Each structure stands twice: as structure tokens, then as C-alpha cells.
Amino acid sequence: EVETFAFQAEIAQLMSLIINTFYSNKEIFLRELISNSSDALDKIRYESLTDPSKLDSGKELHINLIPNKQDRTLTIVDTGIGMTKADLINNLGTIAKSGTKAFMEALQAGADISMIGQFGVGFYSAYLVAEKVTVITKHNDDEQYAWESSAGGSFTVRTDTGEPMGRGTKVILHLKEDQTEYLEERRIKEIVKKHSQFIGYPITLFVEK
Ligand SMILES: NS(=O)(=O)c1ccc(C(F)(F)F)cc1Cl
Questions:
Q1: Residue 134 φ/ψ region, left for φ over 0, alpha for ψ in the -120 to 50 degree band, beta for the rest
Q2: Separation between Cα atoms, residue 69 and residue 119, nearest integer Å
Q3: 120 ligand 1 Cβ < 6 A
Q4: Which of 8, 13, 125, 195 could form a disulfide with 29 if both were Cys (CB 3.0 to 4.6 A apart)?
């Protein structure tokens, strides 16, 4: 059973801008998603300081980067706090309407797309490199859900029948045909070293057969 939702008009506008603007510095998508992962890990760590049972769904706090050249996907997995179904529908836990408004004013006032994370909507930079994004998530207070969008104004949400996650979020980037450099080990390593050197969780880059 799949539910289909329309993006708020302002978020559809943000996604179209990300997809249509000529902007060569696409690599910042990975910094933005790793930063969201770290924020999510901070949240469950803070909750665990006063309630250790919040880690019963998994004590390890980490980020994994999983390229798959056969599927042409880059997956970013974190064991952070996760998202409820309500969170997913509400723009993946962001204040995306007000963040988009601030972001587009900044762009007309000299800013560039790499600054997206300062406006709290960095998730949508995934569409710099992905034709489709799937988000699998598990929050302690809800079931496991799958969010998905190929832009075009709509997204779907469904209960996830896939591999149980324990707790956290998995962002699956179905990469555009000309963006497969982000599946190469040396390219991913370079981006992590450049932009994510001060992330306070282990970032493990998986290798492929
Ligand atoms: N930037 S991201 O897609 O890797 C991401 C990571 C974690 C979370 C959450 F907080 F919910 F766990 C949400 C997102 Cl959207």
C-alpha cells in the first residue's frame, strides 16, 4: 500500500532549482548528507544521556558509505535518531518552507548552491547527482518506512518490507548516468577528507567486490 503526496509548491520549486541550475560543484551533496547524518546521531546520543534504553535499538553510532556500481547507487547509512512517518511527510524533518524562502533570497543576493546547508534544506542537494532518492528510516517511536521521489512534484511513502534497520536512516541515491564518479573509492575518499574531516562519528567507506 503506497501513499502519494504532492510536495508543497515551495519545495517543488527548490528541487527544480537544484535540478535545472547550471552549477558544477555538485560534490557538496555528500557533505550535506553526512552532516544530516551527524545531526541525527547527535540527537539520539543526547536522548541516551538520560535514558539508556533509547539505544536498545542499537548502541553503535556511525555512518557508512556504500557504493554499488551494478545498481548505480550510493547509499549513506547512519544509526541516528531516525524519522517517524510524520517526519518523512513533513519534508524529512526540516522546516523546508521557511528554509527554502531564505535560501532563494540568498541566491539572488550573491550566494550559491553550496550554501544550501546553512538554510536547513541540505537533503535536497541529493538531486544534484541523483535522478531518484529513496529514504529508508526507523525511529524508536514508529515503524520502518520508505520515502521516495524522482522529483516531478510528488513523493511516495510506504511501510518498508525490506531488511529491518534497528534505528536510523538510509539515503539511497540512484545516480544520474553522468554522475558515476561518486561511486569511485578515490573520489569519495577525496570528498570526505575535503568536507567532512571534523564529523565526530566513524565514516566507513565500503569497498566493492
Ligand atoms: N541527510 S540524510 O539524508 O543522510 C539524513 C540522515 C539522517 C536523518 C535522520 F535524522 F532522520 F535520522 C535524516 C536525513 Cl534526511
A1: beta
A2: 32
A3: no
A4: 125
* 123 labelled ligand-binding: yes
Q: Is 92 in the pocket of ligand 1 (CB under 6 A)?
A: yes
Contact assessment for residue 1 and residue 158, using Cβ atoms and an 8 Å cutoff: yes
Q: How was this structure determined?
A: X-ray
Residue nearest to atom 6 of ligand 1 (CA): 37
Judge contact between 173 and 133, C-beta under 8 A. Answer: yes
Distance 36 CA to ligand 1 centre (A): 5
Could you tell me the CATH superfamily of domain 3-205?
A: Histidine kinase-like ATPase, C-terminal domain (3.30.565.10)
**Could you tell me if the CB of 78 is within 6 A of ligand 1?**
yes
Residue spans of the domains in the chain: they are 3-205
Q: What is the resolution of this structure in A?
A: 1.6
Of ligand 1's atoms, which has the minimum distance to the CA of residue 36?
A: 1
150 with 114: CB under 8 angstroms? no
141 annotated as ligand-binding = no
Give 3-state DSSP helix, strand, coil % of the chain, rounded to 5. Answer: 45, 20, 35
| 49, containing H or E segment | helix 28-50
Q: Is any atom of ligand 1 closer than 6 Å to the C-beta of 123?
A: yes
Q: How far apart are CA 28 and CA 114, in angstroms?
A: 6
